[PDB]
Design a protein around this ligand. Structure first.
Ligand code: AR6
Ligand code: AR6
Ligand code: XEG
Ligand code: XEG
Ligand code: ZN
Ligand code: ZN
Lengths: 282, 277
């Protein structure tokens, strides 16, 4: 743990100039329109505009540690609002333009945004989730459960069981949830488009999943302020704030970014809603 | 640049719950409420403060850089920003005094005739000739009340200039006069995310205490005037303010993107009041 390699921390950030940024987001529009099966891969960079620090950015948790300083939080995990990027992905799933959502974030804000749990894989677990040791039953709480490392929380199952409730937060040596990884594996492989937002792609197998989309001819788009493990394999790379990227994208798609009325859990995706007709391309 | 990077205080859960109940009680019994904001109400949208552990001046002093997790154009009003829209709309807020240049008060749709922008607005340029101001969709590009290179279109062709005060620059006499009036004639002054080290900006809440007004200070770090507070809350303003709106029975209204409202609209209905003693 103390020993855990935290990979490359504190790389310099890149900024596309505004004419390049505009042209890259249009091209992204073009790929979303042409693409039958779009998967989104997300990471700690999509939550930074809500006051939760990343791991490996300039003021990341691992970065600050390495220079002997502390990360800073501007909210509690309970008071934290889903970002524009979060709500734009809610909408893209509602209108049937997102097929699946693969996240490394434990920050719980995908679930709180309202995003359907049967189209999300939480590869690293969820700070608001506990799970019965005995029956595998998961409980989505309004407050952080209080333990990390798949340890006992101090509450007992109430299904009719009384099994031991435990946190979902993996430690360094912990095998990824096999249900969430298999679903994420299948959705990455059958994707013809994988878009990574605010991940540096350094954690295996999480950060390799987008690469499975490039077999039998899929396209990869990396959106990221810093470099990432896989920039070499990207058809498009956008250096820019995820919220600026995703609001320009929704505007190109003619969709609005939906309201957030506070924490909610949806188990199962609702039937698809209307979406605008497509531009002619070529 | 004053005291930069003092350590943070955190009220424990029961004390925090009891302080916000009591703020609720002060809001119910108060005739004329003013809100005094600073850079701390925007940190949960990825704009750093000036004097916090990772504030701009604080990081300068340590020869490190501040971090923006957004652009000023992409920044979204926080829960705090929208709760203050709602409290003005139901008539519980008399006036808003802000030290912020971030331009989000206005973008939140808060009415300009009830706001004082003590330190200017990065989206605002002002004709030197006819004093007409323009609220833009992008930051105007200059600081220090310098020429932006656009010209007036009032029929004037005058020189347009940024509104961002520098260190030696007097405060806008209109915004300071209404700020002072409002501070003097209040019975409750509430400060949110300001250290209160800048004068006169940070001295205004004190004018409420003369002829026996109350003052509430809500801040993570200490502040110049903790001594003159009738209540001090050591909490994230979003948590403080979401629980306050709950105690008053109000909703936090929806942001529909960047909008400018010049003049306050007519007051909307509010819940009736509790019994107090
Ligand atoms: N607003 C933003 N816009 C775009 N990029 C951003 C923004 N803010 C930050 N970033 C960038 O977004 C990227 C965030 O990458 P990392 O900090 O490694 O987080 P992970 O999700 O990849 O970490 C995976 C796991 O490792 C941990 O040990 C846990 O186990 C995590 O679950 C960086 O390059 C930032 O430049
Ligand atoms: N989520 C939060 N909740 C509560 N407090 C917070 C939060 N985040 C930060 N803070 C606190 O919020 C406080 C922020 O205070 P300062 O950083 O001095 O900003 P100012 O408005 O007073 O600066 C005045 C002028 O000086 C400048 O030069 C410009 O001219 C400004 O206009 C700190 O104590 C944090 O502890
Ligand atoms: O994981 C928990 O703590 C957070 C803060 C943190 C940290 O300060 C150091 C660190 O090594 C890990 C770490 O993980 C989280 C975090 C950090 C950064 C992010 O970007 C992000 O989204 C989330 C956690 C989990 C539970 O189940 C609990 O019940 C509980 O009380 C706390
Ligand atoms: O002010 C501008 O930049 C921000 C970063 C910054 C800084 O790095 C040093 C400093 O002295 C002032 C300063 O002011 C801003 C700021 C920072 C922190 C806050 O909390 C906050 O509300 C606002 C600004 C304004 C324009 O019109 C421009 O065209 C332009 O390029 C920049
Ligand atoms: Zn059980
Ligand atoms: Zn003019």
């Amino acid at each position: 743990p103390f020993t855990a390699d935290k990979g490359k921390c504190g790389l310099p950030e890149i900024f596309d100039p505004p004419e390049e940024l505009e042209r890259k987001v249009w091209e992204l529009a073009r790929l979303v329109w042409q693409s039958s099966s779009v998967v989104f891969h997300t990471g700690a960079g999509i939550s930074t505009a809500s006051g939760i620090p990343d791991f490996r950015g300039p003021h990341g948790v691992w970065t600050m540690e390495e220079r002997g300083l502390a990360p800073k939080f501007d909210t509690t995990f309970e008071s934290a609002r889903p970002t524009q990027t979060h709500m734009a992905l809610v909408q893209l799933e509602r209108v049937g333009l997102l097929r699946f959502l693969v996240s490394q974030n434990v920050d719980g804000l995908h679930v709180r945004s309202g995003f359907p749990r049967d189209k999300l894989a939480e590869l690293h677990g969820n700070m608001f989730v506990e799970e019965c040791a005995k029956c595998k039953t998961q409980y989505v709480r309004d407050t952080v459960v209080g333990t990390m490392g798949l340890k006992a929380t101090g509450r007992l199952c109430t299904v009719a069981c009384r099994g031991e409730l435990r946190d979902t937060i993996l430690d360094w040596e912990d095998s990824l949830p096999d249900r969430d990884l298999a679903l994420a594996d299948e959705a990455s492989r059958n994707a013809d488009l994988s878009i990574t937002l605010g991940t540096s792609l350094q954690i295996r197998p999480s950060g390799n999943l987008p690469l499975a989309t490039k077999r039998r001819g899929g396209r990869l788009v990396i959106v990221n302020l810093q470099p990432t493990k896989h920039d070499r394999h990207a058809d498009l790379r956008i250096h820019g704030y995820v919220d600026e990227v995703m609001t320009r994208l929704m505007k190109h798609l003619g969709l609005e970014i939906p309201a957030w009325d506070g924490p909610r859990v949806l188990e199962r995706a609702l039937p698809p809603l209307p979406r605008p007709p497509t531009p002619k391309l070529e």
